[PDB]
Curated annotation (Swiss-Prot):
CDD domains with a match to the protein in the record: PBP1_GGBP (cd01539)
Subcellular location: Periplasm
Chief site of localization: periplasm
Effect of G73D: Improductive interaction with trg
Record-level GO cellular component terms: ATP-binding cassette (ABC) transporter complex, substrate-binding subunit-containing; membrane; outer membrane-bounded periplasmic space
Disulfide-bonded cysteines: none
Superkingdom as given in the UniProt entry: Bacteria
Site (Interacts with membrane-bound trg signal transducer): G73
Residues at which beta-D-glucose binds: D13, N90, H151, D153, R157, N210, D235, N255
Record keywords, A-Z: Calcium, Chemotaxis, Metal-binding, Periplasm, Signal, Sugar transport, Transport
Name used for this protein in its record: D-galactose/methyl-galactoside binding periplasmic protein MglB
């Protein structure tokens, strides 16, 4: 069988666990393929050693989810010896690293796109629901529940949901913005506080960096008899999708693990086979990179889930 080596930066990452399991399923549908999976345990030196072992096993391609993005060059140098193609995924190597090797590719999507996609989703519903503009000023008076401060996804989603609304011509007024640390109960408490203070009747839209915090806000709104205020999240968790179905959550955003896995596997398998990376697929490779869009989820596409 054609051997393909895969390294996951750490097995205790939820998103990468979904991606890993999807890669494993995809490989099961390719009987000519033997997948050699590795948990790098959040240690780049461990990952580097795991790559040494993979290469001694004659892998025909490497799919590498780096612990340290700066280690791309190190990995490429190992791959060169046997001219093994490398499909980096989820952690983006530098442009210089990708351009250094004719058989280096990347599959992944900037975190800021989750904010952009969430902003577009909010814009979509805002425009379709002019009654949401409670004070009729043409601006969204919002509150924002932020993930852990300094976490790249908290920072990206917070910055870019507002930038994208504003860029789409929708002025916003930030009535409150605080962290609830990705947590449902913390978010419920924070939203409760806001609904008990001077801004209670001014809030038009609740924006959360994830579904957990969105759901806490949903509960707080219900308790204050303000369920008519729309709430938006990110993650497309099943318990959140249940709320999209019931109308309690206005929308959420999928980080598309299945398609990250599929593009990674498809490219790796083609490259292992000595074929063009996108041969027989509909992936768009743009200067060695496949971007996998975040997807806004609401009542239009909910049946797909
Ligand atoms: C473990 O912390 C994770 C965070 O890394 C992820 O981006 O977003 C998640 C929120 O759904 C957090 O629970
Ligand atoms: Ca308004
Ligand atoms: Na991403
Ligand atoms: Na609501």
């Amino acid at each position: 069988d054609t051997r393909i080596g895969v390294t996951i930066y750490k097995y205790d990452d939820n998103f990468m666990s979904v991606v890993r399991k999807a890669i494993e399923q995809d490989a099961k549908a390719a009987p000519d393929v033997q997948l050699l999976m590795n948990d790098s345990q959040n240690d780049q030196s461990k990952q580097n050693d795991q790559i040494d072992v993979l290469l001694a096993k004659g892998v025909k391609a490497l799919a590498i989810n780096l612990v340290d993005p700066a280690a791309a060059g190190t990995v490429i140098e190992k791959a060169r010896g046997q001219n093994v193609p490398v499909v980096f995924f989820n952690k983006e190597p530098s442009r210089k690293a990708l351009d250094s090797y004719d058989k280096a590719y990347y599959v992944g999507t900037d975190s800021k796109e989750s904010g952009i996609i969430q902003g577009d989703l909010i814009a979509k519903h805002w425009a379709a629901n002019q009654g949401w503009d409670l004070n009729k000023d043409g601006q969204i008076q919002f509150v924002l529940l932020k993930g852990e401060p300094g976490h790249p996804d908290a920072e990206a989603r917070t910055t870019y949901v507002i930038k994208e609304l504003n860029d789409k011509g929708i002025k916003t007024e930030q009535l409150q913005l605080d962290t609830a640390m990705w947590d449902t109960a913390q978010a419920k408490d924070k939203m409760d506080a806001w609904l008990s203070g001077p801004n209670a009747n001014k809030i038009e839209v609740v924006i959360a960096n994830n579904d957990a915090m969105a759901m806490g806000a949903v509960e707080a709104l219900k308790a204050h008899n303000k369920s008519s205020i729309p709430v938006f999240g990110v993650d497309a968790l099943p318990e959140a999708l249940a709320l999209v179905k019931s109308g309690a959550l206005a929308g959420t955003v999928l980080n598309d693990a299945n398609n990250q896995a599929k593009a990674t596997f498809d490219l790796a398998k083609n490259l292992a086979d000595g074929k063009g990376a996108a041969d027989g697929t509909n992936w768009k490779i743009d200067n060695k990179v496949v971007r996998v869009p975040y997807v806004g989820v609401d009542k239009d596409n909910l049946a797909e889930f």
